[PDB]
């Protein structure tokens, strides 16, 4: 049913987001989902070629905020190229595509379900687009 979209891990990241805040000497971009109900401000401090820490502030639907939490936590210590590869994998994931399961997504995999709810793709995609404009 609806339970194949609002999976337990998603609802947990919605209730208890992980990297909540806007932090210091950093690259900070903000985003808004076209249907203005999802707002994100992404904060990333980059260590030469890797992302040492990422945090976010926002207000929006369950899917957008949970995706922001899961993404920010799945990018800690990963490289820029690994991060963009994750983003491309996620974009394929929200369409029909096969995708390369090499590279762990962790909890992010749970958003597979909103492939069957295309009206929320940008909901889940907002966060990641913040990253692609970050670089």
């Amino acid at each position: 049913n609806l339970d194949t979209l609002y999976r337990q891990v998603i609802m947990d990241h919605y209730k208890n987001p992980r990297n909540k805040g806007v932090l210091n000497d950093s690259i900070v971009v903000d985003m808004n989902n076209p249907t203005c109900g999802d707002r994100i401000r992404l904060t990333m401090k980059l260590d030469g070629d890797i992302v040492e820490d990422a945090k976010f502030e926002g207000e929006g639907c369950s899917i957008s905020m949970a995706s922001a939490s899961m993404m920010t936590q799945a990018i800690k210590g990963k490289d820029i190229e690994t991060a963009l590869s994750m983003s491309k994998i996620f974009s394929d994931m929200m369409q029909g595509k096969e995708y390369d399961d090499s590279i762990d997504l962790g909890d992010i995999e749970a958003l597979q379900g909103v492939s069957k709810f295309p009206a929320r793709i940008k909901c889940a995609t907002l966060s990641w687009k913040a990253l692609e404009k970050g670089v």
Partner: protein
């Protein structure tokens, strides 16, 4: 009067399934569906007599031209405009309002002049004026709103001054459902030496329009919201004002004489219709007008008021739902569930086959005025039933229970 079963039978799109549920379409405020009458009008046009219009010499050309101009006459009667000279076919309400802002506003604003609008306005009735004032050095002013989301005539009298040249206001709010006092506002505008521009995108499909009684100087409408084809709308303007406005576009059809460096314009209304016009769309809008007239706009209004009252009463028996706007309203309800973001509400409703809109419904300043980031909105039209209201309310209750157990 309205037999809802017969009415619905004519709308093929209504009789389908979405996620194993009967479609419950409550998004007519975003766009309307089309009866067989209209779709078959388009079919017959493209199957039998498609040809270019006006400049034409052959049989099919004459048939297509008679169709297009007959649709113009149908619109004129539909809104009770004095003359065909005052009916201009456009791309839609947005294009109509932009034509007013381009051709009228920029030629009649100097520094010190004011454009007076509303907090409830659709973006279509906000941004053009923003640009116009900024090009002319004029000033944009906002009529404030009451707690219940209505406008008091007194606030209008306070806001509009002798410096006001243009007052622009939506006939019906697509968010609040308010029916604005357009007649009295037109009188206030005229008493202060101003013209009134009415965004009538949301009223035209649901209410009889009489531009002579309203005494509005401009009136904008969209076909796609009144059972008509996409891509066509109407700009009405008092003949005397259109006479002294420059065209908004330049090209074929709209000219009389063309020299190498200068040209004269055609008489109204063709002055404002550059290039090959929206032929099929205009003919289909005429068909949609015939359909709605045969049903009766007053009967459509009665049906929507009954459904609006029924929906409001059923909504107040739902706890943890805020409804925005006043008691007396058009056929729409904009609301929010506590602790359930409208995107999630829309996903659950669509999972039960129900179609509603979520977001700022193109009224960002109004969202700020309500101190909210987004809303959900169910809208009603001639084909909607009380049963669909029941399905909507039960689905909202399932949404509440689903997100909070």
């Amino acid at each position: 009067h309205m037999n809802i079963t017969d009415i619905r039978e004519q709308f093929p799109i209504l009789h389908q399934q979405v996620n194993g549920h009967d479609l419950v379409y409550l998004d007519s405020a975003a766009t309307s569906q089309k009866p067989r009458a209209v779709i078959e009008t388009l079919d017959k046009y493209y199957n039998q007599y498609n040809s270019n219009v006006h400049r034409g010499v052959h049989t099919l050309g004459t048939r297509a031209t008679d169709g297009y101009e007959g649709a113009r006459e149908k619109v004129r009667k539909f809104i009770n405009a004095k003359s065909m000279a005052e009916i201009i076919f456009t791309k839609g309400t947005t294009t109509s309002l932009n034509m007013v802002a381009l051709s009228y506003a920029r030629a009649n604003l100097k520094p010190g002049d004011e454009v007076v609008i509303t907090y409830m306005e659709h973006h279509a009735n906000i941004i053009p004026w923003q640009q116009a004032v900024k090009a002319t050095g004029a000033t944009l002013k906002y009529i404030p709103l009451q707690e219940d989301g209505t406008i008091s005539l007194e606030d209008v009298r306070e806001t509009v001054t002798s410096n006001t040249k243009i007052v622009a206001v939506s006939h019906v709010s697509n968010v609040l459902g308010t029916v604005n006092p357009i007649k009295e506002m037109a009188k206030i505008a005229h008493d202060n030496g101003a013209v009134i521009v009415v965004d009538g995108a949301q009223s035209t499909p649901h209410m009889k329009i009489d531009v002579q009684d309203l005494d509005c100087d401009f009136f904008a409408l969209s076909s796609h919201k009144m059972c008509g084809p996409t891509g066509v709308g109407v700009l009405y303007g008092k003949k005397a004002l259109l006479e002294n406005m420059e065209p908004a576009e330049f090209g074929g059809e709209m000219i009389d004489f063309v020299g190498l460096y200068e040209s004269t314009w055609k008489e109204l209304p063709w002055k404002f219709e550059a290039g090959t016009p929206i032929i099929a769309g205009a003919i289909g809008l005429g068909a949609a007008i015939d359909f709605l007239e045969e049903i009766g706009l007053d009967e459509i209004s009665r049906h929507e008021h009954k459904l609006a009252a029924y929906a409001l009463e059923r909504f107040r028996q739902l706890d943890g739902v805020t409804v925005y706007g006043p008691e007396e309203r058009a056929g729409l309800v904009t609301f929010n569930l506590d602790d359930v973001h409208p995107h999630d509400v829309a996903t659950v409703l669509d999972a039960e086959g129900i179609a509603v809109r979520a977001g700022h419904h193109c009224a960002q300043p109004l969202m700020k005025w309500l101190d909210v980031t987004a809303t959900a909105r169910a809208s009603f039209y001639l084909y909607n039933t009380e049963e669909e209201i029941d399905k909507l309310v039960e689905a909202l209750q399932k949404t509440k229970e689903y997100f909070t157990n």
